[PDB]
A paper describes a structure:
Using molecular replacement based on fungal ACC CD and CT models, we obtained structures of a variant comprising CthCT and CDC1/CDC2 in two crystal forms at resolutions of 3.6 and 4.5 Å (CthCD-CTCter1/2), respectively, as well as of a CthCT linked to the entire CD at 7.2 Å resolution (CthCD-CT). In all these crystal structures, the CT domains build a canonical head-to-tail dimer29, with active sites formed by contributions from both protomers. The connection of CD and CT is provided by a 10-residue peptide stretch, which links the N terminus of CT to the irregular β-hairpin/β-strand extension of CDC2. The connecting region is remarkably similar in isolated CD and CthCD-CTCter structures, indicating inherent conformational stability. CD/CT contacts are only formed in direct vicinity of the covalent linkage and involve the β-hairpin extension of CDC2 as well as the loop between strands β2/β3 of the CT N-lobe, which contains a conserved RxxGxN motif. On the basis of an interface area of ∼600 Å2 and its edge-to-edge connection characteristics, the interface between CT and CD might be classified as conformationally variable. Indeed, the comparison of the positioning of eight instances of the C-terminal part of CD relative to CT in crystal structures determined here, reveals flexible interdomain linking. The CDC2/CT interface acts as a true hinge with observed rotation up to 16°, which results in a translocation of the distal end of CDC2 by 8 Å.
Author numbering: 1186 to 1212, 1253 to 1379, 1386 to 1464, 1469 to 2187, 2196 to 2259, 2300 to 2311
Write the structure that this text describes.
């Protein structure tokens, strides 16, 4: 136990004899008092106590006594002076002076850890001022004041006491001077258990701070901390710590906290303040080290040498991406820019940190100070699409915090974030910069474990096992699983399994990794999911990129699974030279793991805030539609594709740039955003807007694209393979791209789909067949049946939809949400007109029609039929016809081709009812604007009808005009004659009679509630339920 020593000497010289002889009662802490209040000795009293300690440097050391105090009682009421020597050599800590060690704890100081401290002279022994300069950067220079109060009087005592103590601090800061100080702080600790409560003390707080405030502003004082107690709650204390900061020339910052244990073993800052909970510092330890200026700079640099922004710099990257989002929209849409919220107030974020019962809590604290290798925020961004506000979650790893590795704490956090984004419906964005899961060994068992050899003299003769000494075995026991086996007559505890105290070494990390891997897989299908490769995303991190589906890769950041050197070691030779040689953009964007490639960390954010513009703010919320604004809805589609040559299909979607002017596409000018344009370029996937209505687009590339698969370095006998993916055909990769895109616009994104169908089938070739073309063909069908929002399959001019292709895109796949249209000059059959001709219109069938239309051939036929001509005569008719038919054959072939093409024509399609309407490409925009809008408002009204009615397809005939059995009831409530058609008239009706539908829904809701009540021996049960 720490033995207490107290000795009251009479003199300074005679005090030495009560040291060397008083230490003899020690087989700890020692105090020495004096009776010479003659002079207020300083420095010379320090040169009068140092000779007694440097001489007995081994005397105090041997007894193992830690602290040595020197109290000096003054006869005028003066607070006695105390001097303490601590440690091995007892160097005398200048920090604890003129105050008892018990008071040290009360003085704090463990909060000025990130500072070089040098104290200064104080006229009042109670107050202590310190010069503080940031350990790293010298630009920071501050004066911290530390005062502790304890009474001498046997109600409004404390408020009058406060005036005396703060005036004393102000008068001392005056003599030391304001000098050159960036910030100044003062702490006033109260030892008192006063019976009163902070609510009245806050009213009185306001009173004296406005008087002292002006003076405090001059000294350059930024904040003051008062630490009082309130015994009336039980009559158990409520320690109320209060911080008052002078931010903006006027205080207006009174943060009223409460000292409570977080359950985790730390005392935290739980505030019940009056600055409207949107302030600083909440559920933070009392041990926070008052950070310096530029304290973020070392961490910033560490992230920047890895080529990534420091994690806490990302919220401001998002503010500027939104800032840019308005500056560009005010250009395109002038006037309607009045809702711009300035440079600040763009976004309104709040940190997320694991709560008391591990339930995420919204905190607004200092950047940095992250307890775990992961951080999150709930951001309310005022986008021009949702100018009132829109929320989303942003999760990211701290690449400085243990190279950003995934430990169990990091996992539980990431999870509880995904869990929240789901619970709110708001999208989730992950900023990846990690090092997979955490590795680790038990460090404590490294300098303690023993080895049992076969031969102790020559250890190279193999070792039997590894054991632990009995004294070192009792030290752990729960950190190691040991078996006892006596060898050489020793109690040897052989290590049979190592556990280790510390977490995050092995399997505990894999378990958590698996949890979040599944959580991300689940989330993708519910809320909008997105990832960003801001830096190397390895192992589990690499998978959350794929489970997160929608990924953006910064050019020089790899999505690696197994380390580039780890692979070289496995092969035994230096095959791979870079982590990007197998993880980089040239792999992931070129195989479709990456949807977009961004030049830098900000370019990434920018591109993300771009997808979020297309996506509804919540889960089941209406799309971010705007006024027609740049490209009006009432404009005709100018670019029309040629029938001769090939065309960049992109020109049909947004528009073609030309020498003379610009011919627009069917979507809004430059609203198209192509994704996965590095993988299976035979299909163009992207998002675009149609008169303000955002929607998903899939189109077919007509030009013969060539993907060149790279050479494998692992096999020196591997060369790059030149493969030409001929345009307008479906290949394993193209099919996969299509299918993926569909599910991506389906889950979370919730977008209507536009499919400019132009494929002439599937790749039936041996190589493509073996490459599972059939597997990925199915994936399109599977994906289409899962969809909910409207899908429009529109065959464009020149566009084809032959056999294999048509089957996997037909509206009877999902009749409830699909709608098929075909262009007036489009074609669609079972086979190409060049392909049917050698099956239904063979050589013999063409000659029967030749001996019908051609006059020469049927006249020569009349010669053979009449007979009466010899062997040399019949040869003439044969050599006359088999010359005529030889020259007619090429044009007669083309006749059947045109004949067969008249079957494949659009008209036939409407006649057999496989399409709704024939469409003129010129006015496609004008038609789809009102058909997309009509379907979107109607789909929801029907969804609402069903939700009111039931609180819980069948034929080739199924056409969208009957997609729901309620479209008959809604038809009669509306009253429009041309209901199935006149899309514009319908939309405008709903908009006007918004109140009449909600009138009819409530009528139906009360009617459906009456059915459920009635559906609920049975009579006896009901009687009993009535009695209850």
């Amino acid at each position: 136990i720490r033995k207490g020593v107290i000795v009251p000497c009479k003199d300074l010289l005679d005090a030495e004899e009560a040291l060397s002889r008083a230490l003899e009662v020690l087989p700890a802490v020692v105090n020495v008092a004096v009776r010479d209040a003659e002079g207020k000795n300083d420095e010379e009293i320090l040169a009068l106590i140092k000779p007694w300690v440097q001489n007995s440097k081994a005397d105090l050391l041997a007894r193992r006594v830690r602290r040595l105090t020197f109290i000096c009682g003054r006869n005028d009421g003066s607070y006695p002076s105390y001097y303490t020597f601590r440690g091995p050599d007892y160097a005398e800590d200048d920090s604890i002076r003129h105050i008892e060690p018990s008071l040290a704890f009360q003085l704090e100081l463990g909060r000025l850890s990130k500072f070089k401290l040098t104290p200064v002279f104080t006229q009042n022994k109670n107050i202590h001022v310190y010069e503080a300069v940031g350990r790293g950067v010298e630009t920071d220079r501050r004066y911290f004041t530390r005062a502790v109060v304890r009474p001498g009087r046997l109600a409004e005592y404390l408020i009058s006491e406060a005036d005396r103590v703060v005036n004393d601090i102000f008068d001392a800061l005056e003599i030391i001077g304001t000098n050159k100080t960036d910030l100044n702080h003062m702490f006033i600790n109260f030892s008192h258990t006063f019976q009163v409560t902070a609510d009245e003390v806050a009213e009185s707080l306001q009173g004296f701070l406005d008087r002292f405030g002006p003076r405090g502003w001059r000294l350059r004082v930024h904040q003051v901390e008062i630490r009082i107690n309130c015994m009336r709650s039980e009559n158990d204390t409520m320690p109320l710590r209060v911080i008052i900061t002078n931010t903006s020339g006027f205080v207006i910052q009174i943060e009223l906290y409460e000292e409570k244990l977080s359950e985790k073993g730390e005392w935290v800052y739980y505030y019940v303040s009056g600055n409207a909970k949107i302030g600083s510092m909440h559920l933070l330890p009392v041990s926070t080290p008052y950070p310096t200026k530029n304290w973020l700079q070392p961490k910033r640099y560490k992230a920047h040498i890895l080529g990534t922004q420091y994690v806490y710099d990302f919220p401001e990257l998002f503010r500027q991406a939104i800032q840019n989002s308005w500056t560009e929209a005010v250009k395109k849409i002038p006037s309607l820019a009045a809702k711009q919220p300035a440079i600040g107030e763009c976004i309104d974020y709040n940190e997320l940190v694991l709560g008391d019962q591990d339930n995420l809590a919204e905190v607004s604290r200092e950047p940095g100070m992250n307890s775990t290798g992961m951080v999150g925020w709930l951001i309310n961004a005022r986008t021009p699409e949702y100018p009132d506000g829109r929320k989303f979650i942003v999760v990211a790893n701290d690449i400085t915090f243990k190279i950003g590795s995934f430990g169990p704490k990091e996992d539980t956090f990431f999870f509880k974030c995904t869990e929240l984004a789901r619970k709110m419906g708001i999208p989730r964005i992950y900023l990846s910069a990690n090092s997979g899961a955490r590795l680790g060994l038990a460090e404590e068992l490294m300098p303690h474990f023993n080895v049992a050899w076969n031969d102790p003299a020559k250890p190279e003769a193999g070792f039997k096992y590894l054991y632990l000494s009995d004294e070192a075995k009792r030290r752990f026991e729960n950190e190691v699983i040991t078996e006892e086996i006596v060898e050489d007559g020793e109690k040897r505890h052989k290590i049979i399994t190592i556990v280790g105290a510390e977490e995050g070494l092995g399997v505990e990390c894999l378990r958590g990794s698996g949890l979040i891997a599944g959580a991300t897989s689940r989330a993708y299908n519910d809320i909008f999911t997105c990832t960003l490769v801001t830096c190397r995303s390895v192992g589990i991190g690499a998978y959350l990129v794929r489970l997160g589906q929608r990924a953006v890769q910064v050019e020089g950041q790899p999505i690696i699974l197994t380390g580039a050197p780890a692979l070289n070691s496995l092969l035994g030779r230096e095959v791979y030279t870079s982590n990007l040689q197998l993880g980089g953009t040239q792999i992931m964007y070129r195989n479709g793991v990456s949807h977009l490639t961004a030049k830098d960390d900000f370019d990434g954010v920018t591109k993300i805030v771009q997808w979020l513009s297309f996506i509804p703010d919540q889960r089941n919320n209406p799309l971010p539609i705007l006024s027609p604004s740049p490209d009006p809805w009432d404009r005709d589609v100018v670019y029309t594709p040629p029938y001769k040559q090939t065309y960049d299909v992109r020109w049909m979607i947004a528009g073609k740039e030309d020498e003379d002017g610009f011919q627009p596409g069917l979507f809004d000018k430059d609203s198209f955003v192509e994704t996965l344009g590095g993988w299976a370029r035979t299909v163009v996937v992207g998002r675009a807007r149609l008169g303000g209505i955002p929607m998903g687009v899939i189109a077919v590339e007509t030009r013969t694209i060539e993907n060149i698969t790279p050479a494998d370095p692992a096999n020196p006998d591997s060369i790059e393979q030149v493969t030409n993916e001929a345009g307008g055909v479906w290949y394993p990769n193209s099919a996969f791209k299509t299918a993926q895109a569909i599910n991506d616009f389906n889950y979370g994104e919730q977008l209507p789909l536009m499919i400019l169908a132009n494929w002439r089938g599937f790749s039936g070739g041996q190589r493509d067949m073996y490459n599972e073309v059939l597997k990925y063909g199915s994936f399109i069908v599977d994906a289409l049946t899962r969809f909910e929002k409207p899908i429009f399959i529109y065959i464009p001019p020149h566009g084809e939809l032959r056999g294999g292709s048509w089957v996997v895109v037909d509206p009877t796949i999902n009749p409830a949400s699909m709608e098929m249209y075909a262009d007036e000059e489009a074609r669609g059959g079972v086979l190409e007109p060049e392909g049917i001709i050698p099956i239904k219109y063979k050589k013999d069938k063409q000659l029967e029609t030749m001996a019908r239309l051609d006059p020469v051939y049927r006249s020569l036929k009349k010669e053979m039929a009449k007979e009466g001509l010899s062997k040399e005569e019949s040869d003439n008719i044969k050599k006359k016809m088999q010359q005529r038919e030889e020259l007619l054959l090429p044009i007669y072939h083309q006749i059947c081709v045109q004949f067969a093409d008249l079957h494949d024509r659009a008209g036939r399609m409407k006649a057999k009812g496989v399409i709704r309407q024939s469409l003129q490409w010129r006015q496609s925009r004008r038609f789809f604007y009102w058909r997309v809008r009509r379907r979107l408002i109607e789909d929801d009204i029907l969804r609402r009808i069903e939700e009111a009615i039931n609180p819980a397809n069948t034929s080739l005939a199924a056409s969208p005009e009957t997609r729901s059995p309620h479209l008959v009831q809604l038809e009669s409530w509306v009253g429009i004659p041309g209901f199935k058609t006149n899309d514009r008239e319908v939309v405008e009706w709903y908009e006007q009679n918004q109140d009449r539908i909600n009138e009819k829904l409530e009528k139906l809701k009360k009617e459906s509630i009456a059915d459920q009540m009635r559906e609920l021996x049975x009579x006896x049960x009901x009687x009993x339920x009535x009695x209850x």
